[PDB]
Amino acid sequence: TDPEEHFDPNTNCDYTNSQDAWDYCTNYIVNSSCGEICCNDCFDETGTGACRAQAFGNSCLNW
Numbered sequence: 503t504d505p506e507e508h509f510d511p512n513t514n515c516d517y518t519n520s521q522d523a524w525d526y527c528t529n530y531i532v533n534s535s536c537g538e539i540c541c542n543d544c545f546d547e548t549g550t551g552a553c554r555a556q557a558f559g560n561s562c563l564n565w
Contacts, residue, residue: 508549515544527553529561538565 505524517523526533527540537557541550558565 503548503552505545505549505553508545508552510546510549511544512542517544524553524556528556530556536562 505520509518509520509523511518511523515523517526522531523540523544525531527536527544529536538550538554541553541557545553554565
């Protein structure tokens with residue numbers, strides 16, 4: 503999926519930009535909160551499934 507048509511931030515997200523939230527989630531920007539959790543917290547599961555690949559096996563060693 504793409505993060506464009508998918509936002510659903512639970513009450514622990516902060517950023518309300520698709521790009522910045524995604525970037526940090528996907529370890530693009532070193533931040534020590536990334537992995538599947540950061541996807542889950544800023545995005546529903548569907549958005550998450552994409553963002554997970556971009557943390558899992560793109561930048562972060564472990565999601």
